[PDB]
Amino acid sequence: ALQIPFAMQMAYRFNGIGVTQNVLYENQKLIANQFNSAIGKIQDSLSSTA
Amino acid sequence: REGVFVSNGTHWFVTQRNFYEPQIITTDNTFVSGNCDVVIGIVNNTVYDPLQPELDS
Ligand SMILES: *[C@@H]1O[C@H](CO)[C@@H](O)[C@H](O)[C@H]1NC(C)=O
Ligand SMILES: *[C@@H]1O[C@H](CO)[C@@H](O)[C@H](O)[C@H]1NC(C)=O
Ligand SMILES: *[C@@H]1O[C@H](CO)[C@@H](O)[C@H](O)[C@H]1NC(C)=O
User: Alpha-carbon torsion A28, A32, A38, A41, what sign?
Assistant: First the structure.
């Protein structure tokens, strides 16, 4: 395992889908909020029904 | 442009990400986008322009 900062791992995952990494760093707060919100929907999806 | 920025402690370099081979940071190892204010953890360092010595002829 080679350590890397999470926002730099996400830049290399963005380059992997053909979106240039500045599109992450210029939107990092938005992308973090969208991810944190989407994990929040998983708790509701699994709490409200089996 | 494709790589990582890294530092040995005093100098900044760009490398390919799967094998340490440090290159001097230049306007053709890199690409621009926008002002410095937007990016978390950006650092102040000089980018070398390879045209500057040649156009100085
Ligand atoms: C970092 O690399 C440069 C390469 O020119 C060298 O001059 C410098 O001494 C190095 N610094 C350290 C802390 O090893
Ligand atoms: C990284 O961690 C250190 C120590 O917790 C902190 O001072 C620094 O602000 C963090 N980096 C960023 C980009 O905030
Ligand atoms: C980076 O360099 C600019 C120009 O010298 C300066 O205005 C700015 O305050 C510097 N920022 C840091 C974090 O040193």
Answer: negative
Q: How many CB atoms lie within 10 A of CB A24?
A: 20
**How were these coordinates obtained?**
cryo-EM
> Which residues touch B24 (CB under 8 Å, ≥6 apart)?
B13, B14, B48
Which of B40, B43, B44 has the most ligand 2 atoms within 8 A of CB, as the residue to mutate?
Answer: B40
In angstroms, what is the resolution?
Answer: 3.3
Looking at residue B9, the DSSP 8-state letter turns out to be: S
Q: Whose CA is nearest to atom 13 of ligand 2?
A: B41
Structure tokens at A21: 């990494």
Cα separations (Å) of B5 from A17, B13, B21, B48, B54? 21, 6, 11, 14, 26
Cα A31 from chain centroid? Answer: 6
